[PDB]
Design an enzyme around this catalytic site. Structure first.
Site, PDB file in Angstrom:
ATOM      1  N   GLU B 183       0.811  -1.201   0.000  1.00  0.00           N
ATOM      2  CA  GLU B 183       0.000   0.000   0.000  1.00  0.00           C
ATOM      3  C   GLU B 183       0.860   1.274   0.000  1.00  0.00           C
ATOM      4  OE1 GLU B 183      -3.287  -0.140  -0.235  1.00  0.00           O
ATOM      5  OE2 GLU B 183      -3.672   1.977   0.106  1.00  0.00           O
ATOM      6  N   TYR B 224     -18.200  -0.819   2.177  1.00  0.00           N
ATOM      7  CA  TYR B 224     -17.904   0.230   1.189  1.00  0.00           C
ATOM      8  C   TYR B 224     -19.170   0.868   0.648  1.00  0.00           C
ATOM      9  CZ  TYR B 224     -12.733   0.530  -0.358  1.00  0.00           C
ATOM     10  OH  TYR B 224     -11.369   0.722  -0.498  1.00  0.00           O
ATOM     11  N   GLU B 254     -14.158  28.620  -8.988  1.00  0.00           N
ATOM     12  CA  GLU B 254     -14.215  29.538  -7.863  1.00  0.00           C
ATOM     13  C   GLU B 254     -13.810  28.853  -6.577  1.00  0.00           C
ATOM     14  OE1 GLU B 254     -17.977  31.505  -7.566  1.00  0.00           O
ATOM     15  OE2 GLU B 254     -17.773  32.476  -9.538  1.00  0.00           O
TER      16      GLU B 254
HETATM   17  N1  LIG Z   1     -21.617  42.289  -3.548  1.00  0.00           N
HETATM   18  C1  LIG Z   1     -21.022  41.157  -3.987  1.00  0.00           C
HETATM   19  N2  LIG Z   1     -21.031  40.785  -5.279  1.00  0.00           N
HETATM   20  C2  LIG Z   1     -20.431  39.596  -5.661  1.00  0.00           C
HETATM   21  C3  LIG Z   1     -19.764  38.761  -4.678  1.00  0.00           C
HETATM   22  N3  LIG Z   1     -19.279  37.723  -5.425  1.00  0.00           N
HETATM   23  C4  LIG Z   1     -19.558  37.834  -6.766  1.00  0.00           C
HETATM   24  N4  LIG Z   1     -20.219  39.015  -6.832  1.00  0.00           N
HETATM   25  C5  LIG Z   1     -20.648  39.575  -8.125  1.00  0.00           C
HETATM   26  O1  LIG Z   1     -21.021  38.600  -9.049  1.00  0.00           O
HETATM   27  C6  LIG Z   1     -20.474  38.838 -10.382  1.00  0.00           C
HETATM   28  C7  LIG Z   1     -19.620  37.655 -10.736  1.00  0.00           C
HETATM   29  O2  LIG Z   1     -20.533  36.583 -10.998  1.00  0.00           O
HETATM   30  P1  LIG Z   1     -20.282  35.279 -10.165  1.00  0.00           P
HETATM   31  O3  LIG Z   1     -20.987  35.271  -8.806  1.00  0.00           O
HETATM   32  O4  LIG Z   1     -18.798  35.058 -10.250  1.00  0.00           O
HETATM   33  O5  LIG Z   1     -20.921  34.241 -11.264  1.00  0.00           O
HETATM   34  P2  LIG Z   1     -20.921  32.609 -11.239  1.00  0.00           P
HETATM   35  O6  LIG Z   1     -20.216  32.001 -12.458  1.00  0.00           O
HETATM   36  O7  LIG Z   1     -22.400  32.283 -11.230  1.00  0.00           O
HETATM   37  O8  LIG Z   1     -20.264  32.317  -9.914  1.00  0.00           O
HETATM   38  C8  LIG Z   1     -19.670  40.125 -10.301  1.00  0.00           C
HETATM   39  O9  LIG Z   1     -20.509  41.171 -10.810  1.00  0.00           O
HETATM   40  C9  LIG Z   1     -19.431  40.244  -8.836  1.00  0.00           C
HETATM   41  O10 LIG Z   1     -19.109  41.624  -8.479  1.00  0.00           O
HETATM   42  C10 LIG Z   1     -19.827  39.258  -3.250  1.00  0.00           C
HETATM   43  O11 LIG Z   1     -19.322  38.611  -2.285  1.00  0.00           O
HETATM   44  N5  LIG Z   1     -20.449  40.408  -3.037  1.00  0.00           N
END
Ligand SMILES: Nc1nc2c(ncn2[C@@H]2O[C@H](COP(=O)(O)OP(=O)(O)O)[C@@H](O)[C@H]2O)c(=O)[nH]1
Ligand SMILES: CC(=O)O[C@H]1C(=O)[C@@]2(C)[C@H]([C@H](OC(=O)c3ccccc3)[C@]3(O)C[C@H](OC(=O)[C@H](O)[C@@H](NC(=O)c4ccccc4)c4ccccc4)C(C)=C1C3(C)C)[C@]1(OC(C)=O)CO[C@@H]1C[C@@H]2O
Ligand SMILES: CC(=O)O[C@H]1C(=O)[C@@]2(C)[C@H]([C@H](OC(=O)c3ccccc3)[C@]3(O)C[C@H](OC(=O)[C@H](O)[C@@H](NC(=O)c4ccccc4)c4ccccc4)C(C)=C1C3(C)C)[C@]1(OC(C)=O)CO[C@@H]1C[C@@H]2O
Ligand SMILES: Nc1nc2c(ncn2[C@@H]2O[C@H](COP(=O)(O)OP(=O)(O)O)[C@@H](O)[C@H]2O)c(=O)[nH]1
EC number: 3.6.5.-
Lengths: 429, 441, 429, 441
Positions: B183, B224, B254
């Site tokens: 292992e 399992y 992300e």
């Molecule tokens: N106020 C705010 N806006 C957010 C946050 N995270 C993402 N956004 C907004 O969401 C947009 C990005 O889209 P996102 O959430 O990444 O899209 P996804 O692909 O669906 O995750 C941008 O306009 C950001 O400014 C946050 O913590 N606070």
């Protein structure tokens, strides 16, 4: 005349504006489908500030929806208000932003901005005499921060004399829900300095605080906090759309809110905010509304004004009200609290009074403050920034996307210089 | 379209996938014969089956997944079993002899014979994709196919594609429980591609799951089959914000932007908080506040580890169901308050929340109850170095006498390769010693 | 008065015209059988431009259908509109053209053209006062290219002063579906130079681009692309058939579209093009239609006007419209885009305004452009031509049929000389 | 009327035709007793049976085909079999001894005895034609009748007719699989008439078909009966646009104009993309885009060849069924994009598409499934020279010792004829060396 182009950008940008065009669409009696169902001809005299009339009395906003992700667009389309927008204004890519600034500003933003400025010119070429623009976006996102500041820095090259303002959401350290939001906020504060005419800094904690304490809500969502914010954004341009006793455009505020260039970061405030039930126990009056607009617990920016001095404020009242009580209350304040005002400016307050309240109450007001206490925002970020950046954490996702270090160090210095601009204008006589 | 590729390698990798692809069938409302029933005149890729299911014409859903084994036997449990017409016939690729707990066989001798047939299955699924997200390799460190073949594939996937995310769901060797005596040989040699080629490697191990079944869940005697329903709820939540609506959605990229500090510090352990038996599901207070605290429990870990022995570097809250955010932000602020939870001094801003609306499904015959809320916490910590110190020491024991070396050299690798993959893993464990420590002035 | 003889030639020629006489047959309310079922007496005043009235108010077009293959004729006969043509006008051979120019122009074309010019004289001897002719055909086919240019070069010997124009489909390199279409297009460009009064160059890629982007179609066939083209061909001769405020025949365009002889290659354009659903969201106006007629993405020729200069354009509007808005929009364009126009011609635009829109909407328009950017067409062909011909590929199927090399080299040089005719008239002051 | 003549020569040529004339019976709705059933009060030569079926009076359809063999035995499978009253009695011409894998016997000794009776059958079908298109000779290189007789006929067909197309459907000798040991002797000698007299010679071979049956189709154990249903779908599509409506129809002469660069460069291989087993027909994405890519696959070739070893010179897409063209033009543009596909530098404009509306028929008891779309790609490539190099080398081995020479000389040919047909084929293989190469300046 005096049209406003609306560029709601990112996820956050779209959520607010979704609720924003649910308020405006109630101000003017717009059906969900896009027909008009009002009764008063005030609703139509100045409908054109936001809405293109289209063929057969349908009313299409002048809003452009930008995204790097199909999702928000599909939500808005499929919702109550999908019908209201023009389908050529739902501009979106496929690959998500990463909550990465570089990815929305250089790589995947630049690819799309050509197909969006071509939509800006559909709107700008149709207007009689354009006044201004507006982003609705988020400092701390990928598209809100990055793509927003790419759109801005490409409009100043086209339309270099229109009031471009933002309603930007700024991070608070008490409520974190993204690890690199210092990286994403630092690199966009850098762009908002040189490029924007007014900036309405809004936080999250400041909106829960209104919900919990003032409104006596239980369980707030983004849905509820932006419902507040949209009642501020309606207030801003009220006298642009409704007749008043004092009028006040976008440009009227800008001019006497802003002592020096570059210091264009405002703190909104709304009043009244009561719970339901606790409305028959407040008598609703001009001294009632004034006290809410100057209390710290009704700031939509998570600061206390008491940690500085208001340079200038504006007071935008909406309702059938007097002018003596307005002119007096706004006087009795900058006498009793004369150490809370910058003293090298006489008459820190500008009043505007519209005639048209929101569609449930009499005598609302809106406070917009240029306080020196906003450096409390810029320092709480530039402490988190400098604590990650000294390790160079999360760096390869940024240098991977066309950026380099020297964009950071300069952008950190542009944020830390304007801390020393609010600082100079707080103290020193 | 947010499409993604599952690859299920080796015995453990296949048999997890049974428990994965059982679940998505329930998530998107798909019968085991690949059919959505008649009560779905609603938006399919709006419920977004379309990240894991290419919709064949005439209402038929076949995955974007590939089941690969060097042994015929494991996949033949999937033919028949009950999933015998869920799967596309050509995505169940069998060898004839397994690597037989021998990395040299899975990577050089046996693995090369089917590697181009597997990469060609990838292309048939890669070209049907519009907006390809990345790959989900499932395996176990400490098989032959799970280690030897996976190492061979991840090389080829980095060359052809590059750009996309490549998640791994490994099973790490458990400190006491082990069933192969080589292992540790097969784990040192899989170190090479796991840090280099993967973008985010997860680790689980069987003992830390035995704890949870017995203690949180009052199952007497796990197999399992029981553990892998648990595994699948962690992955089902990971990839749920791609494919359902919610505020604060989180793509596959992300994570890595918000979870991973540096290039090779990408070994985050997952947890899952509402592991509750039916009877114990009353006597609940299963709010957001309690379920956030339960993630930070050193007993509710999916790794034989104790975060009280290291510092967290990032966390990452992925919630499903009946959720109000301000309850979460008030539960974060509690987490920041406690001093038993050590973040590092360069983090400051703790962590990333993500919410989704789609509640989990109770797997039929499954071990969970009906919960309203559910939380994985993907979380970098310096405490996963302790899992490594306990396994290097087993390798360093056996390799001190050059024990099972003669099997490996006579299969297509060198004695020299042990000394390089031992240095390679010793450097990782040195990175976490140097990443836990703050800098002072 | 002012009759138009229609000679639809080849396979492509017949498909377009099939759909062409489905539009015209709707313009004038012609039944499928050939009776009249209109209501407005505008439909009959000028019916005779296209239709011979026959015994007992049946209306037989003046169209002649030519082919070297029985198939298209049998399709048209057996379809909805077989009844409409006269059966002596279905002129066709048996042995196919080969998608070979030599086979349609010398061997199997010359055999048939005697039996077709005898049908041209049935039509031409019946007219009051003939205006013009028209092919509908394809540069890149056997009968469209070869037999078409044999018919043309034998009409100039009979009718040497009638406006003979073609709606010719030209090849695009992005969409190839014939290997020797350079050979077949080169040898017919040679004939269209010396023999034709106007030539409306149409491509394929330019028609998908309209379907995908503008119309928001999903799955276009030849059926759909020629349905567009027929809405252009209707527009051309609208003021010949309907009353207008400005009139404009075939000859009126020709005269002030064409600076020098030989430069008679036009780029059409149609507006409006909306999807269904996105029609209640465009307001339909003269500035709306003008912007579509000058946007590159509404050209039915696969070029970008931005790679040259319009010599001259014509703007043919169809509808109850104003004349100031027309005269202004057409002014504001050749001011704002003055570097997109040839400057040695003042007032590059000719407007015509009819009174009669198509039978679904108000206020259509048709853009017909003499742009210098059409040398982008002639060079993309003369690169494929010169890449095959340097090997002498596919040569024995041509020299086998009565041609020789020296017909090629001269025809290559006649195409490459007029590239140096659009080039001269783009630049040089 | 677009009429055409099939000639079926030798054992392979007959036995293909069974599988051809099985199919057209299904295409045009004809019972094996030559009768259209009562549910056809529609246009017959509008469905255009009239290119392959002369309609005898009283509703009876007899082909324009001639079945020729020097051996009585093969055609006697057609008398009876099931086709015993489909065929005209006088178009089934038998000898008494076959050429017996001996070119000298099929061309000089035995072939001349029936050649005028066969040419007189052609005239009885040639004079019934209105708008004769050309001839379709079926045979195999490496029989006696397929090579010796076909060479004799094609001489006579060039003299009497000249002008018309004369397609060939050869079977080329396979590199490993062969059943005659003088297989290369009979292929060198058929070289002469194949390049000179035919207008377009197709080549197939049995191994490249074995691959497709086993791999694409999951047949365990093919016979000739299985392969020839495949052969027939290639020819059925070729000649379908003569005889059905579609946009972009393609006559028999529009191949040669669009497929064939120079006089003797007329050896295009065919493919066929939707070779899919019933079970594997789900787990389809059988769009236009995927089926165009499948033509360009080096595994889906009908010749033991790999177009990755040469450059394409022309291609030629012939599609049947539920087709939208813009899907095709977007799939062309993908094909032009890839650099694994080498066109030549003097082609530029790749290739010719042709579409037809009539979908294929599933042959009853046949190997295919029900597909909606289908694509032959006739395509000149310089990679068919490689098939030749592998067969000249077998000829050059045996002729180095003058092995089976004594059989051939004592039958009506010379030793000298080997040295001419070897030079003749060596010049072809030199033409493809000089046609692959671009010219530079
Ligand atoms: N106020 C705010 N806006 C957010 C946050 N995270 C993402 N956004 C907004 O969401 C947009 C990005 O889209 P996102 O959430 O990444 O899209 P996804 O692909 O669906 O995750 C941008 O306009 C950001 O400014 C946050 O913590 N606070
Ligand atoms: C009977 C009565 O007077 O009730 C009031 C009321 O109780 C209060 C508490 C309202 C109420 O608002 C909320 O409780 C609220 C909910 C979510 C997010 C933000 C607020 C009210 O719901 C909202 C509502 O607002 C309006 O109708 C305005 O036109 C407003 N429109 C909307 O946003 C809207 C909301 C729901 C449904 C339809 C429209 C507006 C404000 C500014 C600019 C443009 C429009 C009003 C006056 C009231 C109720 C109904 C209780 C308040 O809010 C607003 C936006 O006016 C909260 O503090 C103010 C003070 C009001 O007095
Ligand atoms: C409520 C309404 O106004 O509906 C319109 C419509 O929605 C639009 C989108 C139409 C529509 O056209 C298409 O969708 C289309 C389909 C196949 C191929 C090409 C287009 C329309 O179908 C086509 C139709 O066209 C006509 O009736 C004209 O008379 C037109 N005739 C034909 O081509 C024709 C169509 C069907 C049957 C018989 C003839 C014409 C145009 C120019 C010159 C001569 C005639 C119209 C106006 C409409 C609909 C009905 C939705 C558009 O097309 C035309 C040619 O007018 C597409 O872009 C234009 C703009 C129109 O506004
Ligand atoms: N729009 C268009 N028209 C074509 C095309 N090819 C041929 N044509 C037209 O078809 C006619 C020429 O016939 P062709 O198609 O060669 O005849 P066939 O091939 O023997 O049936 C002319 O009217 C041409 O304008 C093409 O690719 N596009």
């Amino acid at each position: 005349m005096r049209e406003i182009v609306h560029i709601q950008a990112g996820q956050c940008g779209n959520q607010i504006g979704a609720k924003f065009w649910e308020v405006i669409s109630d101000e003017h009696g717009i059906d969900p489908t896009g027909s008009y169902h009002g009764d008063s001809d005030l609703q139509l005299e100045r409908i054109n500030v936001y809405y293109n009339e289209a063929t057969g009395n349908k009313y299409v906003p002048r809003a452009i929806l930008v995204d790097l992700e199909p999702g928000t667009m599909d939500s808005v389309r499929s919702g109550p208000f999908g019908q209201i927008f023009r389908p050529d204004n739902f501009v979106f890519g496929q690959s998500g932003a990463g909550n990465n600034w570089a990815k929305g500003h250089y790589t995947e933003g630049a690819e799309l901005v050509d197909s969006v400025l071509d939509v800006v010119r559909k709107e700008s070429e149709s207007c009689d005499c354009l006044q201004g623009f507006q982003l609705t976006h988020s400092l701390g996102g990928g598209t809100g921060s990055g793509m927003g500041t790419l759109l801005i820095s490409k409009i100043r090259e086209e339309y270099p004399d229109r009031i471009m303002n933002t309603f930007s959401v700024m991070p608070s350290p008490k409520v974190s829900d993204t690890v690199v939001e210092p990286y994403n906020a630092t690199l966009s504060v850098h762009q908002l300095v040189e490029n924007t005419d007014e900036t309405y800094c809004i936080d999250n904690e400041a909106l829960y605080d209104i919900c919990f304490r003032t409104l006596k809500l239980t369980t707030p969502t983004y849905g509820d906090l932006n419902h507040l914010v949209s009642a501020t954004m309606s207030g801003v341009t009220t006298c642009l759309r409704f007749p008043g006793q004092l009028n006040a455009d976008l440009r009227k505020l800008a001019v006497n809110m802003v002592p020096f260039p570059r210091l264009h970061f405002f703190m909104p405030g709304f009043a009244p905010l009561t719970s339901r039930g606790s409305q028959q126990y407040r008598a609703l009056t001009v001294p009632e509304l004034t006290q809410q607009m100057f209390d710290s617990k009704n700031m939509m920016a998570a600061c206390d004004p008491r940690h500085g001095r208001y340079l200038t404020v504006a007071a935008i009242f909406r309702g059938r009200m007097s002018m003596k009580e307005v002119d007096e209350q706004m006087l009795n304040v900058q006498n009793k609290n004369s150490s809370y005002f910058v003293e090298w400016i006489p008459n820190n307050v500008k009043t505007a009074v519209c005639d048209i309240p929101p569609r449930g109450l009499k005598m609302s007001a809106t406070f917009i403050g240029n306080s020196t206490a906003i450096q409390e925002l810029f320092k709480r970020i530039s402490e988190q920034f400098t604590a990650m950046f000294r390790r160079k954490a999360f760096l390869h996702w940024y240098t991977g996307e066309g950026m380099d270090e020297m964009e950071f160090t300069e952008a950190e210095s542009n944020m830390n210089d304007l801390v020393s601009e609010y600082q100079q204008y707080q103290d020193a006589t | 379209m947010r499409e993604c590729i599952s690859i299920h390698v080796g015995q453990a990798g296949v048999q997890i996938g049974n428990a994965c692809w059982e679940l998505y069938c329930l998530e998107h409302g798909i019968q085991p014969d690949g059919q959505m029933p008649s009560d779905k005149t609603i938006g399919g890729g709006d419920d977004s089956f379309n990240t894991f299911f290419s919709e064949t014409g005439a209402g038929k859903h076949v995955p974007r997944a590939v089941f690969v084994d060097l042994e015929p036997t494991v996949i033949d449990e999937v033919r028949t079993g009950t999933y015998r017409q869920l799967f596309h016939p050509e995505q169940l690729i069998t060898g004839k002899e397994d690597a037989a707990n021998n990395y040299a066989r899975g990577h050089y001798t046996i693995g090369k014979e089917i590697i181009d047939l597997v990469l060609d299955r990838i292309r048939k699924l890669a070209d049907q994709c519009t907006g390809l997200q990345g790959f989900l390799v499932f395996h176990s460190f400490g098989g032959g196919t799970g280690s030897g073949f996976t190492s061979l594939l991840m090389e080829r996937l980095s060359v052809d594609y590059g750009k996309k995310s490549k998640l791994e769901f490994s099973i790490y060797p458990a400190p006491q429980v082990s069933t192969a005596v080589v292992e540790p040989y097969n784990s040192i040699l899989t170190t090479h591609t796991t840090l280099e080629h993967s973008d985010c490697a997860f680790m689980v191990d069987n003992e830390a799951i035995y704890d949870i079944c017995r203690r949180n869940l009052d199952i007497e005697r796990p197999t399992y089959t029981n553990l892998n329903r648990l595994i699948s709820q962690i992955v089902s939540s990971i990839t749920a914000s791609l494919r359902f609506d919610g505020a604060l959605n989180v793509d596959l990229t992300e994570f890595q932007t918000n979870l991973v500090p540096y290039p090779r510090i990408h070994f985050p352990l997952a947890t899952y908080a509402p592991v509750i038996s039916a009877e114990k599901a009353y006597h609940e207070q299963l709010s957001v506040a309690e379920i956030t605290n339960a993630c930070f429990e050193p007993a509710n870990q999916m790794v034989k580890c104790d975060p009280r022995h290291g510092k967290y570097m990032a966390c990452c809250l992925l919630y499903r169901g009946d959720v109000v955010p301000k309850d979460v932000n008030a539960a974060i602020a509690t987490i920041k308050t406690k001093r038993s939870i050590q973040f590092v001094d360069w983090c400051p801003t703790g962590f990333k929340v993500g919410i989704n609306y789609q509640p989990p499904t109770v797997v039929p015959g499954g071990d969970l109850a009906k919960v309203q809320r559910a939380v994985c916490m993907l979380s970098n910590t310096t405490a996963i170095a302790e899992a490594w110190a306990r396994l290097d020491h087993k390798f360093d024991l056996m390799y001190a006498k050059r024990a099972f070396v003669h099997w490996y050299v006579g299969e297509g690798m060198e004695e020299g390769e042990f000394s390089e993959a031992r240095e390679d893993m010793a450097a990782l464990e040195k990175d976490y010693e140097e990443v836990g420590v703050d800098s002072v002035e």
